Design brief:
- This is part of a larger assembly, with ten protein chains of ten kinds.
- In chain G, strand 1 and strand 2 form a beta hairpin.
- With 208 residues, chain G is of the alpha/beta class.
- Chain H has one domain.
- In chain H, helix 1 runs antiparallel to helix 2 and helix 1 packs parallel to helix 3.
- The radius of gyration of chain H is 18 Å and the shape is flat.
- By secondary structure, chain J is largely without helices or strands.
- The termini of chain J are far apart.
- Classes of the chains: A mainly alpha (171), B alpha+beta (125), C little secondary structure (48), D mainly alpha (112), E alpha+beta (176), F little secondary structure (97), G alpha/beta (208), H mainly alpha (115), I alpha+beta (386), J little secondary structure (29).
- Chains G and I meet through strand 3 and helix 3 of G and helix 1, helix 3, helix 9, strand 7 and strand 8 of I.
- The structure holds Coenzyme Q10, (2Z,6E,10Z,14E,18E,22E,26Z)-isomer, the ligand C=C(C)[C@H]1Cc2c(ccc3c2O[C@@H]2COc4cc(OC)c(OC)cc4[C@@H]2C3=O)O1 and iron/sulfur cluster (2 copies).
- The site of one iron/sulfur cluster has 14 residues of chain E, from helix 4.
- Chain B: This is NADH dehydrogenase [ubiquinone] iron-sulfur protein 4, mitochondrial.
- Chain B: It is a peripheral membrane protein.
- Chain B: Keywords: Electron transport, Membrane, Mitochondrion, Mitochondrion inner membrane, Respiratory chain, Transit peptide, Transport.
């Protein structure tokens, strides 16, 4: 996630359709998003790390959230009315197929549908950002720098301490 | 209407100098030596304050000499030694002072070139 | 040249349509003038 | 009689003779409170007495301006007011007293 | 000695009053300005047909730099470093050494055209007329690194512009 | 200018003056772009004799500033820094614009 | 001596010397020294406590009336106990003359503001505060005038480096212009130009 | 004695009360600065920065130097309140693009030629 | 509370990089706060690291509208400190090009002042004459504006053998251009309603606020440095000083136009009275020798080497030298410690004091009136910020 | 033994240069 991501911006842009389609209301999916600067610093440290030759790393964020809680927090930061509804998997896949037709960058695709509604894997045997000296940055400290652009004029000056971070299902 | 301050004068907080350029720097207070390629002594009159040499590397493009020391070109000129010492003390810099060197007076004699028995007589003129 | 024009319009050049390697029918610039004609064109001398 | 002195903000002063007399008399009165041996007092009394005598001895405005060399007598009135204000300030400051402090040893030595 | 710019008054006779009233009510001075603008429209414009026409220049004009040679092909530069010493912008970098035949020549001669102020002090300081500011001014680039000249670029500039540089010096050296 | 006489009359009437007398554009009345070589006379100090530099050395005639009553060291008529400035005259050429 | 040497005017020299006599006599409490240079320029060195009196006199006295403040600047001499030398240049239109008044201070001693005497000083003193760090007491609004907002230091001091301590560049990650410790692709090349032989024997100093 | 002239304070008590009033003003102003400049930092972060800036000069014992520091702090606060500073000037206090320079001996030995 | 507005730096009417923070009640100005230093390049500190010849081009960049004037002021200061004298021909050339520079500066000022008000056409009419004057600059020096022609011993090179005739041909047609500009502006009623009684300043306030040049003469003060304190052959030319009456924008506009006319007069006199002789002081320890002598004479070569590597040493001392630049009194306080480098160089520009007085001059006016006042103060920020 | 050639005004002088304001009448009653 970041300023130019297709993760926070993707969920924020769905306000244009009125309601937010979430498969199983987004209660069956768990996400662990990571900050962009953390990934860049990890790549740099892996370049400068002499013992990271043949290793495989897993860069994940510090908190895990359900998709519903994540999207609710996203809409709370952008101060937009959250109106989520459950859409069946086949219908929302059909919507992705419909959006695939465009000759430009698609708004959504069936593959994006599949990747969004899938839980993030847990890989405790792989090294992470802490092995490279990087402390992962939680979403709650960098969400405002991404989602302030999606606010109207009346909420544009609201501070970061005003959103009451979402619930995390950790362990 | 006076306040009679006691402790040593220190203006380090009012100069805007980064800490690493105060606590790690060492200045030299000295009278520069005469350039032996010349006989003039006009450059040996005033005292000088300079800083310790830092790293200089070469530019990847065009091979110029790049530096990161902001005080690499700073030289200060003083009348007396204690003036420079006071300036360094009030600016919070550690200093090394080299005492002035002067050429000792020499006894010259043109007649000594033609001594009757001394070794001073010159082979050629 | 045309000496009846005012100073500035009294000398001019029509550029070639094919310089060293590129087509210069539409793409022309002042760097295509050789130094001697450059001296003539910028009125640094009166002699071609 | 004269119109448009020529300097913006400096209005024409009708009947400037008694105004100048008043100003010079006030300057003399305030100088009377300064110690006699002060150089400021003697110098300012000398020049203001010269000017006051010149003003008394000439009824014409143009000839008075020519002799005073003060530049268009309205400016002479302005300078008289300035001198009176300075005299009051000088009376409060008292700079005829000896030097307050000598400078450090080599404060004014140039070069270096 | 001085004059007044705005210290006049208008006449009060009824003819002048009526003239001023007619000026106010019929806008005569505005018509005069309109007339002035109209006059310009029929005049020949001062525009020249660039790039097919060029503005007038002078032999003293100082533009792109160049290193010159002797008629035999030997470089004039003797690595005296006076151009580097005099350069107000410190835009010249020189490194020298003895050549294979003992000649005093440079190994590095760089001019930073983004540092240079095109004052021409370097060609006044040169005692052998090695470095000059040529007539060229149409040398704009697309990258910053292209304006960092080395000795090869300057020698190529000299070889490219020598025919005109020598002619310009021939018409100017008697004023120096 | 190669303008026609009708247009010239139109411009002259519109501007109220004669334009062809003073034209902004330079046609052929200008100096040649090729000129004969100059000679550039030499200065006064180009003598062969009686030209010692010590007799024409401006920099060595400079002196430290004169001290007028340093502090560390009879009516006395008052003085001004300079004589009062003389009044200006009103432009016999053209006094009013 | 005729063609290439600047002619000397002794009438103006005597006039300026006499006026220095006059000024030093009227104000013994503050005037420390009076000098006249050989190109006919008059300087008065005064104790700092007399900034407001002396200036006011020079503005308001009939014989002086120096009614214009041409410039107000400072000079840094690090070898002096009082580091900063404050220079006032005044112009008298009535007598067509120019005068210079100089005083001194250090990093911690303030100087009375002369805005009451000369309204033109308001910005000048600010520059002296900005460039040298000299504080002026009783200034209507004293703040930085020439340097960037939040700029630390006073660049016109002799001990301040030529290129400063920080430099600005645009960072895309934080999406803003940021300041970092200064680094130079090419270091400023220091030239030792002074000749080892003196040029002017008239300014030779005692042999120490 | 040293025969020294004051700026505002006679001793350290007046200087300390001036320091306290300046700290009060900065503490009050921080939330308004965060809202106006649309900073992504918290109010607690800004107040920690203010506290750290004040504590950097905790060693000063000269009342004159303390007075000058308070004057400079008032100028900084005036620039911040009037929005003369931009977001860049406010955010320069945090050094978010400078990599952490290590302090111990071995890291300095490993990185470069200077202490 | 009033509305706070940012005028500039990216504003066509800001005349460059100026951040005028204004409080407005409606469009009525309650306070102007000029924020400057957006073009502060640290020129004085940079000069402290150069030789006296190396520091000369900085003065070209100070007031980039009037270049030879800055060069002349700096050269006069260095000549005074050196105790040398320029040759008569050099002085006449200096005065001639100073008057040409005055014409350039007044064209620039008047045309952009009218451009701010809304008169866009005289700018185009007069910049052709400005282009011809840059042609003169380039012919004499090789640069269109940053000539570096005037040196602290005279001038760099002599005039080319056809320059005087071309300057004469230019000079006999410029009065018609001034007349056409005056026909557009002087008697226009819109121009008068925009400029008359706008930014009125009294003579005493102008004196106390440090104004100079037209800013004084608009208020009726009879002061001109070329007449009261001549610094060149100026005491041998004849001209009149335009003097205003009301102290407003219109009077200052009239004064600048009449100064253009008087500059034409002085240029005619200079063209008539150009004397022969050398162009720089005949003292090779200050001015470089001729290239032929440098290439044939030992002393000439030594002096060329030492002048272009180290430079001449100036005797220790301090001077304040001021001239009547087209914008007002331009001065330099120069401090020399006896070396080949200046110890200190303070630059005094009239724009500093004029911009300090802008807030006083803008009282009780509208936004457009403040634009007019900024225009009439003739402000260039290269010299205000340095 | 060539003579000095230098940029000088011609023998006598240059022609008069007009500088005064010239705004013609150009009006009716
Ligand atoms: C950041 O990246 C992205 C983009 O790039 C900038 C996009 O454009 C983009 C999709 C583009 C939308 C933001 C535009 C949506 C516009 C509306 C939904 C149009 C629908 C409204 C009706 C057609 C109007 C009439 C109302 C109906 C009920 C009938 C997305 C999702 C995205 O994520
Ligand atoms: C719009 C056309 C007719 C012309 C006028 C013009 C430009 C381009 C840029 C500018 C400009 O004029 C404005 C106002 O006057 C000055 C005067 C300046 O120097 C005095 C100065 O230097 C930065 C800048 C400016 C403005 C600058 O933005 O093309
Ligand atoms: S033109 Fe001037 S700035 Fe450029 S390289 Fe030559 S001396 Fe240096
Ligand atoms: S270019 Fe000329 S001045 Fe520069 S080093 Fe070469 S010979 Fe010397």
């Amino acid at each position: 996630f970041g300023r130019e991501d297709r993760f926070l911006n993707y969920f924020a842009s769905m306000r244009w359709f009125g309601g937010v389609p979430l498969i199983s209301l987004g209660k069956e999916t768990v996400k662990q998003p990571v900050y962009i600067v953390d990934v860049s610093k990890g790549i740099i440290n892996a370049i400068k790390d002499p013992d990271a030759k043949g290793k495989t790393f897993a860069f994940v964020g510090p908190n895990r959230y359900l998709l519903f809680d994540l999207v609710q927090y996203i809409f709370a930061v952008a101060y937009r009315p959250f109106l989520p509804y459950p859409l069946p998997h086949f219908a929302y896949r059909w919507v992705g197929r419909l959006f695939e037709v465009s000759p430009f960058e698609p708004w959504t695709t069936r593959d994006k549908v599949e990747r969004v509604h899938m839980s993030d894997m847990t890989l405790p045997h792989l090294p992470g950002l802490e092995d490279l000296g990087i402390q992962a940055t939680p979403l709650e400290l960098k969400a405002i720098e991404v989602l302030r652009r999606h606010r109207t004029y009346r909420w544009l000056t609201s501070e970061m301490e005003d959103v009451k971070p979402a619930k995390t299902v950790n362990i | 209407q006076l306040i009679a301050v006691d402790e040593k004068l220190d203006i380090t907080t009012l100069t805007g100098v980064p800490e690493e350029h105060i606590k790690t720097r060492k200045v030299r207070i000295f009278v520069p030596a005469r350039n032996n390629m010349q006989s003039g002594v006009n450059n040996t009159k005033k005292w000088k304050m300079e800083f310790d040499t830092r790293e200089r590397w070469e530019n990847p493009l065009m091979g110029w000499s790049s530096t990161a020391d902001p005080l690499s070109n700073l030289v200060l000129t003083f009348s007396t030694k204690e003036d420079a010492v006071a300036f360094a003390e009030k600016n919070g810099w550690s200093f090394d002072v080299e005492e002035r060197k002067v050429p000792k007076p020499k006894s010259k004699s043109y007649g000594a070139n033609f001594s009757w028995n001394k070794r001073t007589r010159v082979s050629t003129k | 040249e045309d000496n009846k024009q005012f100073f500035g319009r009294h000398r001019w050049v029509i550029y070639t349509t094919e310089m060293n390697g590129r087509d210069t029918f539409w793409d022309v610039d002042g760097s295509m003038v050789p130094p001697e004609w450059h001296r003539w064109l910028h009125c640094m001398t009166d002699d071609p | 009689l004269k119109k448009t002195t020529g300097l913006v903000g400096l209005a024409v002063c009708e009947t400037p003779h008694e105004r100048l007399k008043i100003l010079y008399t006030k300057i003399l009165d305030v100088l009377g409170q300064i110690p006699k041996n002060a150089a400021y007092r003697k110098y300012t009394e000398q020049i203001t007495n010269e000017k006051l005598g010149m003003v008394k001895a000439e009824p014409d405005v143009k000839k008075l301006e020519e002799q005073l060399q003060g530049g268009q007598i309205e400016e002479v009135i302005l300078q008289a007011e300035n001198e009176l204000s300075l005299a009051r300030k000088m009376l409060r400051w008292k700079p005829w007293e000896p030097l307050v402090e000598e400078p450090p040893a080599n404060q004014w030595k140039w070069p270096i | 000695t001085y004059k007044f710019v705005n210290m006049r008054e208008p006449s009060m006779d009824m003819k002048s009053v009526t003239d001023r009233a007619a000026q106010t009510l019929l806008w005569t001075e505005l018509v005069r300005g309109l007339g002035m603008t109209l006059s310009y429209l029929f005049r020949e414009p001062a525009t020249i047909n660039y790039p097919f026409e060029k503005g007038p220049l002078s032999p003293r004009f100082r533009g792109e730099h160049a290193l010159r040679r002797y008629p035999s092909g030997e470089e004039r530069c003797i690595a005296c470093k006076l151009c580097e010493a005099v350069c107000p912008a410190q835009a010249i970098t020189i490194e020298a050494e003895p050549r294979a035949d003992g000649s005093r020549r440079t190994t590095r001669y760089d001019i930073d055209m983004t540092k240079c102020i095109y004052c021409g002090f370097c060609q006044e300081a040169c005692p052998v007329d090695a470095i000059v500011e040529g007539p060229n001014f149409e040398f704009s680039t697309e990258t910053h690194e292209e304006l960092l000249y080395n000795k090869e670029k300057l020698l190529n500039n000299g070889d490219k512009w020598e025919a005109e540089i020598a002619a310009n010096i021939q018409a100017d050296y008697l004023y120096r | 200018a190669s303008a026609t006489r009708v247009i010239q009359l139109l411009r002259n009437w519109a501007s109220g003056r004669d334009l062809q007398a003073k034209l902004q554009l330079r046609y052929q009345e200008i100096s040649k772009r090729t000129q004969p070589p100059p000679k550039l006379p030499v200065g006064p100090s180009h003598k062969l004799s009686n030209n010692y530099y010590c007799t024409r050395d401006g920099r060595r005639e400079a002196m430290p500033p004169s001290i007028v009553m340093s502090s560390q060291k009879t009516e006395k008529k008052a003085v001004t820094p300079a004589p009062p400035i003389k009044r200006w005259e009103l432009s016999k050429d053209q006094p009013y614009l | 001596t005729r063609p290439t040497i600047r002619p000397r005017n002794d009438v103006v020299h005597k006039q300026l010397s006499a006026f220095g006599q006059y000024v030093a006599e009227i104000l013994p409490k503050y005037v420390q020294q009076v000098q006249v240079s050989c190109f006919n320029e008059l300087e008065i060195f005064i104790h700092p406590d007399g900034v407001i009196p002396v200036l006011t006199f020079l503005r308001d006295h009939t014989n002086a009336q120096f009614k214009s403040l041409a410039d107000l600047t400072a000079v840094d001499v690090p070898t002096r106990q009082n580091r900063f030398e404050i220079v006032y240049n005044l112009l008298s239109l009535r007598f067509n003359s120019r005068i210079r008044v100089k005083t001194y201070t250090d990093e911690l001693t303030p100087i009375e503001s002369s805005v009451t005497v000369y309204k033109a000083a308001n910005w000048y003193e600010r520059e002296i505060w900005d460039m040298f760090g000299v504080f002026f007491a009783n200034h209507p609004d004293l703040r930085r005038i020439l340097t960037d907002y939040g700029f630390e230091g006073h660049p016109f001091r002799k001990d301040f480096p030529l290129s400063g301590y920080v430099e600005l560049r645009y960072d895309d990650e934080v999406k803003r212009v940021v300041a970092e410790p200064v680094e130079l692709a090419q270091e400023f090349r220091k030239f030792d130009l002074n000749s080892p032989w003196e040029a002017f024997p008239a300014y030779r100093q005692p042999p120490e | 004695g040293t025969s020294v002239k004051p700026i505002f304070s006679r001793d350290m008590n007046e200087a300390k009360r001036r320091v306290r009033e300046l700290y009060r003003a900065w503490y009050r102003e921080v939330p308004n600065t965060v809202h106006l400049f649309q900073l992504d930092i918290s109010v607690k972060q800004g107040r920690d920065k203010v506290r750290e800036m004040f504590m950097k000069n905790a060693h000063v014992t000269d009342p004159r130097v303390v007075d000058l520091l308070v004057i400079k702090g008032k100028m900084e606060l005036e620039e911040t309140i009037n929005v003369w500073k931009q977001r860049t000037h406010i955010m320069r206090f945090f050094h978010e693009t400078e990599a952490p320079r290590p302090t111990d001996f071995l890291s300095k030995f490993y990185v470069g030629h200077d202490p | 509370s009033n509305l706070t507005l940012n005028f500039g730096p990216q504003h066509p009417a800001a005349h460059g990089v100026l951040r005028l923070v204004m409080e407005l009640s409606g469009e009525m100005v309650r306070k102007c706060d000029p924020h400057i230093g957006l073009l502060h390049r640290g020129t004085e500190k940079l000069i402290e690291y150069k030789t006296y010849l190396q520091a000369l081009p900085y003065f070209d960049r100070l007031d980039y509208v009037s270049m030879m004037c800055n060069e002349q002021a700096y050269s006069l200061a260095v000549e005074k400190l050196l105790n040398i004298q320029p040759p008569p021909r050099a002085q006449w050339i200096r005065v001639l090009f100073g008057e040409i520079t005055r014409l350039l500066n007044h064209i620039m000022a008047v045309t952009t002042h009218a451009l701010d008000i809304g008169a866009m056409t005289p700018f185009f009419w007069m910049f052709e004459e400005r282009e011809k004057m840059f042609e003169f600059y380039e012919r004499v020096s090789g640069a269109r504006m940053h000539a570096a022609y005037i040196r602290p011993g005279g001038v760099h090179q002599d005039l080319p053998l056809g320059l005087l005739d071309d300057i004469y041909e230019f000079s006999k047609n410029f009065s018609f251009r001034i007349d056409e500009l005056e026909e557009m502006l002087t008697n226009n009623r819109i121009w008068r309603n925009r400029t008359v009684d706008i930014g009125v300043v009294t003579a005493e306030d102008a004196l106390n606020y440090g104004f100079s040049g037209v800013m004084l003469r608009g208020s009726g003060i009879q002061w001109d440095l070329r007449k009261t304190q001549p610094y060149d052959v100026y005491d041998q030319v004849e001209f009149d000083v335009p003097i205003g009456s009301r102290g407003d924008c219109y009077d200052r506009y009239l004064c600048r136009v009449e100064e253009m006319r008087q500059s034409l007069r002085i240029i005619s006199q200079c063209l008539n009275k150009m004397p022969p002789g050398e162009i720089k002081v005949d003292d090779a320890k200050v001015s470089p020798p001729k290239r032929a002598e440098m290439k044939t004479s030992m002393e000439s070569l030594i002096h060329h080497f030492k002048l272009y590597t180290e430079g001449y040493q100036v005797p220790p001392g301090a001077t304040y030298t001021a001239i009547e630049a087209p914008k007002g009194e331009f001065g330099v306080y120069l401090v020399s410690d006896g070396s080949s480098r200046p110890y200190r160089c303070k630059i005094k520009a009239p724009g500093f004091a004029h911009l300090a007085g802008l807030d006083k001059m803008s009282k009780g006016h509208m936004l457009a009136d403040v634009v007019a006042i900024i225009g009439t103060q003739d402000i260039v920020f290269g010299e205000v910020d340095r | 033994a060539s003579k000095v050639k230098q940029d000088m005004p011609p023998p006598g002088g240059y022609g008069p240069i007009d500088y005064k304001r010239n705004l013609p009448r150009r009006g009716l009653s």
